[PDB]
Design a protein around this motif. Structure first.
Motif, PDB file in Angstrom:
ATOM      1  N   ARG A 429       0.838  -1.190   0.000  1.00  0.00           N
ATOM      2  CA  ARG A 429       0.000   0.000   0.000  1.00  0.00           C
ATOM      3  C   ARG A 429       0.876   1.244   0.000  1.00  0.00           C
ATOM      4  O   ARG A 429       2.030   1.221   0.435  1.00  0.00           O
ATOM      5  CB  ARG A 429      -0.938   0.028   1.215  1.00  0.00           C
ATOM      6  N   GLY A 430       0.305   2.340  -0.501  1.00  0.00           N
ATOM      7  CA  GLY A 430       0.968   3.620  -0.536  1.00  0.00           C
ATOM      8  C   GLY A 430       0.409   4.593   0.485  1.00  0.00           C
ATOM      9  O   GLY A 430      -0.359   4.237   1.382  1.00  0.00           O
ATOM     10  N   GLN A 431       0.815   5.855   0.332  1.00  0.00           N
ATOM     11  CA  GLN A 431       0.367   6.890   1.259  1.00  0.00           C
ATOM     12  C   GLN A 431      -1.089   7.267   1.026  1.00  0.00           C
ATOM     13  O   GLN A 431      -1.752   7.758   1.945  1.00  0.00           O
ATOM     14  CB  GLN A 431       1.254   8.131   1.140  1.00  0.00           C
ATOM     15  N   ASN A 432      -1.605   7.053  -0.185  1.00  0.00           N
ATOM     16  CA  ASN A 432      -2.972   7.426  -0.514  1.00  0.00           C
ATOM     17  C   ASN A 432      -3.534   6.445  -1.535  1.00  0.00           C
ATOM     18  O   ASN A 432      -2.842   5.543  -2.019  1.00  0.00           O
ATOM     19  CB  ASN A 432      -3.042   8.864  -1.042  1.00  0.00           C
ATOM     20  N   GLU A 433      -4.813   6.639  -1.866  1.00  0.00           N
ATOM     21  CA  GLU A 433      -5.492   5.729  -2.780  1.00  0.00           C
ATOM     22  C   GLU A 433      -4.913   5.812  -4.185  1.00  0.00           C
ATOM     23  O   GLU A 433      -4.867   4.804  -4.895  1.00  0.00           O
ATOM     24  CB  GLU A 433      -6.989   6.033  -2.805  1.00  0.00           C
ATOM     25  N   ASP A 434      -4.479   6.998  -4.611  1.00  0.00           N
ATOM     26  CA  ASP A 434      -3.850   7.112  -5.922  1.00  0.00           C
ATOM     27  C   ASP A 434      -2.548   6.322  -5.976  1.00  0.00           C
ATOM     28  O   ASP A 434      -2.264   5.651  -6.974  1.00  0.00           O
ATOM     29  CB  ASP A 434      -3.609   8.582  -6.257  1.00  0.00           C
ATOM     30  N   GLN A 435      -1.746   6.383  -4.911  1.00  0.00           N
ATOM     31  CA  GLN A 435      -0.542   5.562  -4.853  1.00  0.00           C
ATOM     32  C   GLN A 435      -0.886   4.078  -4.829  1.00  0.00           C
ATOM     33  O   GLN A 435      -0.188   3.265  -5.443  1.00  0.00           O
ATOM     34  CB  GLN A 435       0.295   5.935  -3.632  1.00  0.00           C
ATOM     35  N   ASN A 436      -1.953   3.706  -4.121  1.00  0.00           N
ATOM     36  CA  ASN A 436      -2.378   2.311  -4.121  1.00  0.00           C
ATOM     37  C   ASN A 436      -2.765   1.858  -5.523  1.00  0.00           C
ATOM     38  O   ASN A 436      -2.443   0.738  -5.938  1.00  0.00           O
ATOM     39  CB  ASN A 436      -3.543   2.124  -3.152  1.00  0.00           C
ATOM     40  N   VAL A 437      -3.454   2.718  -6.271  1.00  0.00           N
ATOM     41  CA  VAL A 437      -3.848   2.368  -7.631  1.00  0.00           C
ATOM     42  C   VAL A 437      -2.626   2.277  -8.534  1.00  0.00           C
ATOM     43  O   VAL A 437      -2.567   1.437  -9.437  1.00  0.00           O
ATOM     44  CB  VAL A 437      -4.873   3.377  -8.175  1.00  0.00           C
ATOM     45  N   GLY A 438      -1.646   3.158  -8.330  1.00  0.00           N
ATOM     46  CA  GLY A 438      -0.400   3.032  -9.067  1.00  0.00           C
ATOM     47  C   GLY A 438       0.295   1.715  -8.784  1.00  0.00           C
ATOM     48  O   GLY A 438       0.809   1.055  -9.694  1.00  0.00           O
ATOM     49  N   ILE A 439       0.308   1.307  -7.517  1.00  0.00           N
ATOM     50  CA  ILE A 439       0.852   0.002  -7.161  1.00  0.00           C
ATOM     51  C   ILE A 439       0.099  -1.096  -7.897  1.00  0.00           C
ATOM     52  O   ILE A 439       0.702  -2.030  -8.437  1.00  0.00           O
ATOM     53  CB  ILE A 439       0.790  -0.201  -5.637  1.00  0.00           C
ATOM     54  N   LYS A 440      -1.231  -1.004  -7.922  1.00  0.00           N
ATOM     55  CA  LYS A 440      -2.031  -2.048  -8.552  1.00  0.00           C
ATOM     56  C   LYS A 440      -1.782  -2.114 -10.053  1.00  0.00           C
ATOM     57  O   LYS A 440      -1.720  -3.206 -10.625  1.00  0.00           O
ATOM     58  CB  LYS A 440      -3.514  -1.818  -8.262  1.00  0.00           C
ATOM     59  N   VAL A 441      -1.649  -0.962 -10.713  1.00  0.00           N
ATOM     60  CA  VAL A 441      -1.384  -0.989 -12.148  1.00  0.00           C
ATOM     61  C   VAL A 441       0.004  -1.548 -12.413  1.00  0.00           C
ATOM     62  O   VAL A 441       0.208  -2.277 -13.390  1.00  0.00           O
ATOM     63  CB  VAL A 441      -1.563   0.402 -12.792  1.00  0.00           C
ATOM     64  N   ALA A 442       0.980  -1.234 -11.559  1.00  0.00           N
ATOM     65  CA  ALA A 442       2.298  -1.838 -11.715  1.00  0.00           C
ATOM     66  C   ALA A 442       2.228  -3.353 -11.564  1.00  0.00           C
ATOM     67  O   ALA A 442       2.827  -4.093 -12.353  1.00  0.00           O
ATOM     68  CB  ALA A 442       3.272  -1.242 -10.703  1.00  0.00           C
ATOM     69  N   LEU A 443       1.493  -3.833 -10.560  1.00  0.00           N
ATOM     70  CA  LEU A 443       1.365  -5.273 -10.360  1.00  0.00           C
ATOM     71  C   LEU A 443       0.670  -5.936 -11.541  1.00  0.00           C
ATOM     72  O   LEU A 443       1.066  -7.024 -11.972  1.00  0.00           O
ATOM     73  CB  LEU A 443       0.604  -5.562  -9.066  1.00  0.00           C
ATOM     74  N   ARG A 444      -0.378  -5.304 -12.071  1.00  0.00           N
ATOM     75  CA  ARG A 444      -1.084  -5.874 -13.211  1.00  0.00           C
ATOM     76  C   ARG A 444      -0.203  -5.888 -14.453  1.00  0.00           C
ATOM     77  O   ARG A 444      -0.239  -6.844 -15.236  1.00  0.00           O
ATOM     78  CB  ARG A 444      -2.378  -5.101 -13.465  1.00  0.00           C
ATOM     79  N   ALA A 445       0.594  -4.837 -14.653  1.00  0.00           N
ATOM     80  CA  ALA A 445       1.541  -4.817 -15.759  1.00  0.00           C
ATOM     81  C   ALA A 445       2.638  -5.855 -15.588  1.00  0.00           C
ATOM     82  O   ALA A 445       3.180  -6.337 -16.588  1.00  0.00           O
ATOM     83  CB  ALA A 445       2.161  -3.428 -15.896  1.00  0.00           C
ATOM     84  N   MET A 446       2.971  -6.213 -14.347  1.00  0.00           N
ATOM     85  CA  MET A 446       3.938  -7.282 -14.126  1.00  0.00           C
ATOM     86  C   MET A 446       3.504  -8.577 -14.798  1.00  0.00           C
ATOM     87  O   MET A 446       4.356  -9.415 -15.117  1.00  0.00           O
ATOM     88  CB  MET A 446       4.138  -7.519 -12.628  1.00  0.00           C
ATOM     89  N   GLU A 447       2.202  -8.758 -15.019  1.00  0.00           N
ATOM     90  CA  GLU A 447       1.683  -9.921 -15.726  1.00  0.00           C
ATOM     91  C   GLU A 447       1.745  -9.767 -17.238  1.00  0.00           C
ATOM     92  O   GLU A 447       1.493 -10.741 -17.954  1.00  0.00           O
ATOM     93  CB  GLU A 447       0.232 -10.182 -15.311  1.00  0.00           C
ATOM     94  N   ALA A 448       2.069  -8.575 -17.736  1.00  0.00           N
ATOM     95  CA  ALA A 448       2.027  -8.339 -19.175  1.00  0.00           C
ATOM     96  C   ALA A 448       2.963  -9.242 -19.967  1.00  0.00           C
ATOM     97  O   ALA A 448       2.550  -9.719 -21.036  1.00  0.00           O
ATOM     98  CB  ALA A 448       2.333  -6.865 -19.463  1.00  0.00           C
ATOM     99  N   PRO A 449       4.207  -9.488 -19.548  1.00  0.00           N
ATOM    100  CA  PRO A 449       5.077 -10.354 -20.365  1.00  0.00           C
ATOM    101  C   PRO A 449       4.510 -11.747 -20.585  1.00  0.00           C
ATOM    102  O   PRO A 449       4.513 -12.243 -21.719  1.00  0.00           O
ATOM    103  CB  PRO A 449       6.382 -10.381 -19.559  1.00  0.00           C
ATOM    104  N   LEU A 450       4.024 -12.397 -19.527  1.00  0.00           N
ATOM    105  CA  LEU A 450       3.454 -13.731 -19.680  1.00  0.00           C
ATOM    106  C   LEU A 450       2.233 -13.701 -20.586  1.00  0.00           C
ATOM    107  O   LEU A 450       2.064 -14.575 -21.446  1.00  0.00           O
ATOM    108  CB  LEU A 450       3.093 -14.302 -18.310  1.00  0.00           C
TER     109      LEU A 450
END
Ligand SMILES: Nc1ncnc2c1ncn2[C@@H]1O[C@H](COP(=O)(O)OP(=O)(O)OP(=O)(O)O)[C@@H](O)[C@H]1O
Ligand SMILES: Nc1ncnc2c1ncn2[C@@H]1O[C@H](COP(=O)(O)OP(=O)(O)OP(=O)(O)O)[C@@H](O)[C@H]1O
Ligand SMILES: Nc1ncnc2c1ncn2[C@@H]1O[C@H](COP(=O)(O)OP(=O)(O)OP(=O)(O)O)[C@@H](O)[C@H]1O
Ligand SMILES: [K+]
Ligand SMILES: [K+]
Ligand SMILES: [K+]
Ligand SMILES: [Mg+2]
Ligand SMILES: [Mg+2]
Ligand SMILES: [Mg+2]
Lengths: 524, 524, 524
Positions: A429-450
């Motif tokens: 988690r981040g400091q705010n909800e926007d940071q949390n969403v940024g974390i989530k988009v990074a995690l979802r993009a981590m699946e992009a190569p596969l």
């Protein structure tokens, strides 16, 4: 010149369109089922390559804002190529996924700066998790698997690279060049083999081989260039009294000195061969000193103070064997102190650490490989020049991946390491909800190569990603066989350094790209 | 060439359209919620930046009159960058607001000259009120807060800059450069560390470090370049008799002199190391004299009159330690008179005051930092070059803001200082009603930065401005948290110099811009 | 023809651009400070109007998708005009706000169907709250205030409309027409004044007035048209024996019958005047029967069965006074049963309820106003035709608003009723988060009218809306005086029907508009 300025959703949409053009040209190369891209060259035939970095470098769009996005996202592939030499397509895919999801979030009204901060935090945590999940890659089997995977599943390339590293050792050097034959060849040379041939063809002791062969010769290392026999006459007289052969390493031997040495060579009083010192200014002296350290000798120079008239047999170096040809000079088993050789190697290592240039550090590492370890050349065999270029690119990618694996270890391939990392970071988690969403988009993009690998194989990316995520550890999806299993056992390995570098560069570029609200370019 | 001439409302409308284009490209970068602008570069990848000055510099319009307005209002950002190095976006916003309100007044039929005079009077009073409201910023905590705010809330940048200033002191120098790593690094060097390495690699006393280390050596400072050992032989003999090592700082040591020094270095009679004097003509002598003052020595020159044959140990300087490497020479604890060092520092300060060139004054300040204080380098860590450029721009803005804060103090950030100043100046009046209206438009534009910050955060600028104005003192609106509070307590601080400079430059440009009635440009 | 198809953000952006064009042309007319829009007419001079419906009707865009959006949002103003005759600009503003916020939510990724459902739920609750908050408007003072506000603060128009309604009563009719003079005139006619003049100029009893005046005359109502005196001779003989005058209401009296009636008129045996029956087929009979009911008579027809030869004095109707002119026939105090007149009025009311046509129902209501109540004509006074059109539009808006107020009551004006309704509905929730967001966007758009009024007045919409929301009840902002107070006390009233209709139509259109994902139109 006059500028077109675009704002908000329009500029971001054009930026994403360009990024998608570049990433779509690049990602077709991802995976064992990945295809090749043909790049037109203004000079020569088109280049067929499976390298995302090459494709991105060639990409350039008519629309200025789309081209802006393409250029920005091309930095990802360029930096991945520069750092790891592999994972360029994966990095481009990650950047495209991060940009797409982050731009969705931006249109969603979240703060782009907070999205970028969340992406950065997620990527830092992901790098830490990659380091934790990585395992050392010291076995030749793992090295061969890594090379094979990076060479688009060319077991021959992988095993050749494994053999080359086994031969040259940790401090050894490996380079890739073109080959005349159809088969990949490995040429390993140990000790010093600097590219300087005999200064006079008549020094050849063995004519049928066209080479000078000296057994247990002295070595006279002269920093200056010599044209007269007077300065060396005491040394030649001492050598003749000793009876053993002699090898001269000098800036240049010519005129009277060279002629006298040659004449003495026939007459048989002294078996003398002379060659040019290797390298050029400020490097010739260093290489001369490394040869002196190897052979237990001293370099004769005017700056140091000693003169050649005063040189002695003890001053002269010693080596067990020497082989000179028109092309190269090789010294075998120089009689020098091992402690001294290691000290000089450590000094060159300190110089490499101080160095900030790729050319300087690779030359220093070549010096280390000459002193200790060895130097290997992989001559890529191909029937045509286009095939040669493609296979050379694949072999260079394999070599870079193997070096990355030895440096930082290996992780499960096929986009499995990033999937596992995101699963571990689900609670981040981040400091705010926007940071949390940024974390989530990074995690979802981590699946992009596969997902992109699966898509190139033609199967269902969502189903494959869901199955992999439901799995644990190194469980993954084999794109080649279209089956699931332990990627480590199946031999599908990706360097932790490659994966981390792709993620880091893609994240940085994509975060800054999503943080954009205005684009300024030249008018059409 | 033939000219298009526009008059009255048409010319002013086109001028305002161009100013609004530039200011709209720039103001999206204002605030912690401010976004980034991507600037296409004819060479290399696009630059992503949050700098209003960079955006304005790139802005250029097709319409000649709109481009005229854009160029005029770009001077505001350029001058703010040149003077304070920060507040460029704020200055551009202020200029846009002043231009808009003043052009409303002009269409209202008021005298543009009187409007400009009223704006100037209001800005003078506002600068005086800013000086009154400013508080000294001498604490490292306040400095770190200022740097963090100026770096778009990068606490790491702020604390790094605070540490650098604490280390180097008041007279110290800080510079920002690129870094190889991903993390921001701080490298502080005290005393003299001029960039001149050993003239001969064989001077290295410590081989594993590749550096010369001299303990309590003499220092011989020669203004001339030397190629013979005769002129120095008395000095070397005296040094050998003394027994301590020796460091030569000269224009050049080469040939016989260098060779003899090196040979003596091995032989051990004298531990002598030689290096080039730092800088070039008309600065080499100054730096040599500063080294002489630091080490309690005298510079040997032909102009001064003394000769090297007559040089003595008392003439030679003295220092506690010396470390030479291939890159730089460092003298540690030069044995020199503190009164003399302060006198030389004061002379260099007088030279800085007399200086009218940025390069000259920064070189003089670097000399001061070498003599006393220290020199700090902030290597900005970024994964890619675009991120490196953005972070370097932010770090430079933070450094400039911190310097401005120490020079002139700090005020409440978020556009609160200007709001309070306008509230205090509500009673200000001019010679006539047009001047009063100019004062009023200046005061209303003083609210523009806070309103634009609120607008970029997405909230209601009028509501936020009304609440802030109803508040008193440092009460303000936190754009990051979207809450109200004491900006000083929350750490939202802006240099008084930055705020004043933005206001002054924006006011001057905007007043002259509104005083316009005709625009003459080239035809399309 | 070939079709251009647009999808997602592009189609929605073009749709919003067109909606914004139309709403921006319309909303400048909102408020007492609202401006006028000039609409070019292919025929005649341009029309200057403050009517959002007229502006929207004229709006039409080149871009097919923008024009699509404009046409869709124009239905809001058209339907508001058709239903309430006022609040068209308010409805357009509400639709624009709802569309903008809902499209933000859609780009946010929420379900457009759920957003529409939430908007519908919020609007239903808002209509219920408007009904609860409404107060009956039965006082002439409130009616005059409503008319004045709807006429852009024309107290003369408001008081004139109040007087007209007071004169004509609840069942009375009021119409607006052009006037020859510069001042607004009110002409009220009671009882029956159907537009049929004397069939023969010689019937004029009073020459200086050019009109027939009959005191206590009989009335003979004939459904057929008559050309011979034989069928009526018994009736004329009975009338002459009685001695009182006689009025004939017939389809047509001509030839021998008309000539004989006229000759008898001079001779003085019977004071007889004849006129055409009013209206046309299937309405002439109805109006004849209403006259019969008013005067206590019976209509002579062939379908009913009675013949004119058998008609008697008892069959003939009776009225106290009759005045005929070339233009109109008026019957004053018809001697008929009040119970019968109310029964006929109730029958006409039932016919109005059954009616589904505006023309049919207004003709029926005119019949009711002739039977009971009265008919008023407001002749709008203007110096020029453009001013006449503008003032007539304002007077029609005032009349429609007053009718809406009497029908459904009044609420606080200036967008205060919607603000209070949204405040009451703050706790409203839907089935899911998307429905909740739709509710929230509807509530936020409920503030759009007040904000737009404030913006047209030049003040700060957010500040004014915040102050109004902080207030309670009828507290609001006076756009005319730019002050706050009780809108009811200040006389700023809006019909609850107008507000509800604007909200409902805007909500329906805007919800369907935001639910759009594809737009299909003709290619350019
Ligand atoms: N048999 C396989 N099964 C599953 N994944 C595989 C297999 N072979 C390779 N991969 C994966 O394919 C991914 C992409 O490899 P590829 O060499 O095509 O591109 P890259 O590493 O992204 O970059 P570059 O274009 O610079 O070589 C690697 O991460 C590797 O893990
Ligand atoms: N958390 C915050 N809350 C409120 N205001 C803030 C906050 N952080 C920064 N600010 C204000 O943002 C304003 C703009 O800062 P920013 O660095 O974006 O631009 P600038 O100072 O106008 O110029 P430049 O573009 O040259 O950096 C500064 O005045 C600062 O007071
Ligand atoms: N003095 C006033 N103070 C505040 N609000 C006012 C005042 N006078 C009028 N209004 C408001 O102005 C709003 C708009 O009135 P206006 O007649 O301009 O347009 P409308 O009702 O939206 O539609 P139309 O264009 O069809 O007449 C009305 O809701 C009324 O409440
Ligand atoms: K690839
Ligand atoms: K900025
Ligand atoms: K209106
Ligand atoms: Mg690869
Ligand atoms: Mg700044
Ligand atoms: Mg109205």
């Amino acid at each position: 010149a006059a500028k077109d300025v675009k704002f908000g959703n329009d500029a971001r949409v054009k930026m994403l369109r360009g990024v998608n053009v570049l990433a779509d040209a690049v990602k077709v190369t991802l995976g064992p089922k990945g295809r090749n891209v043909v790049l037109d060259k203004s000079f020569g035939a088109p280049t067929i390559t499976k390298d995302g970095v090459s494709v991105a470098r060639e990409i350039e769009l008519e629309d200025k804002f789309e081209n802006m996005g393409a250029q920005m996202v091309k930095e990802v592939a360029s930096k991945a190529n520069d750092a790891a030499g592999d994972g360029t397509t994966t990095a481009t895919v990650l950047a495209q996924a991060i940009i797409t999801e982050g731009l969705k979030a931006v249109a969603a009204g979240m703060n782009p700066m907070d999205l970028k901060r969340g992406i950065d935090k997620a990527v830092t945590a992901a790098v830490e998790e990659l380091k934790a999940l990585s395992v050392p890659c010291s076995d030749s089997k793992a090295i061969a698997q890594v090379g094979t995977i990076s060479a688009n599943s060319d077991e021959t390339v992988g095993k050749l690279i494994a053999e080359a590293m086994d031969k040259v050792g940790k401090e050894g050097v490996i380079t890739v060049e073109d080959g005349t034959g159809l088969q990949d060849e490995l040429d390993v040379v140990e000790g010093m083999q600097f590219d300087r041939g005999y200064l006079s063809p008549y020094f050849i002791n063995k004519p049928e081989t066209g080479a000078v062969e000296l057994e247990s010769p002295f070595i006279l290392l002269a920093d200056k260039k010599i044209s007269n026999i007077r300065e060396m006459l005491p040394v030649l007289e001492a050598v003749a009294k000793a009876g053993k052969p002699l090898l001269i390493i000098a800036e240049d031997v010519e005129g009277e000195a060279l002629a006298t040495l040659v004449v003495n060579t026939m007459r048989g009083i002294v078996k003398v061969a002379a060659v040019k010192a290797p390298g050029f200014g400020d490097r010739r002296k260093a290489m001369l000193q490394d040869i002196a350290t190897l052979t237990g000798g001293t370099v004769i120079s005017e700056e140091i103070g000693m003169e050649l008239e005063k040189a002695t047999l003890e001053d002269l170096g010693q080596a067990k064997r020497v082989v000179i040809n028109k092309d190269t000079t090789t010294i075998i088993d120089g009689v020098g102190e091992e402690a001294a050789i290691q000290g000089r190697v450590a000094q060159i290592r300190q110089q490499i650490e101080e160095a900030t240039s790729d050319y300087d550090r690779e030359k220093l590492q070549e010096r280390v490989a000459k002193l200790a370890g060895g130097v290997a050349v992989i001559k890529v065999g191909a029937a045509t020049e286009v095939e040669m270029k493609e296979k050379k690119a694949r072999v260079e990618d394999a070599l870079h991946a193997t070096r990355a694996a030895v440096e930082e270890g290996v992780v499960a391939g096929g986009g499995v390491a990033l999937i596992r990392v995101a699963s571990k970071l689900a609670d981040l988690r981040g400091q705010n909800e926007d940071q949390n969403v940024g974390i989530k988009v990074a995690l979802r993009a981590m699946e992009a190569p596969l997902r992109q690998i699966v898509l190139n194989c033609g199967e269902e990316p969502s189903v494959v990603a869901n199955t992999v995520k439901g799995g644990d550890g190194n469980y993954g999806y084999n794109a080649a066989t279209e089956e699931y299993g332990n990627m480590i056992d199946m031999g599908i390995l990706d360097p932790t350094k490659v994966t981390r570098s792709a993620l880091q560069y893609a994240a940085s570029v994509a975060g800054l790209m999503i943080t954009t609200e205005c684009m300024v370019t030249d008018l059409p």
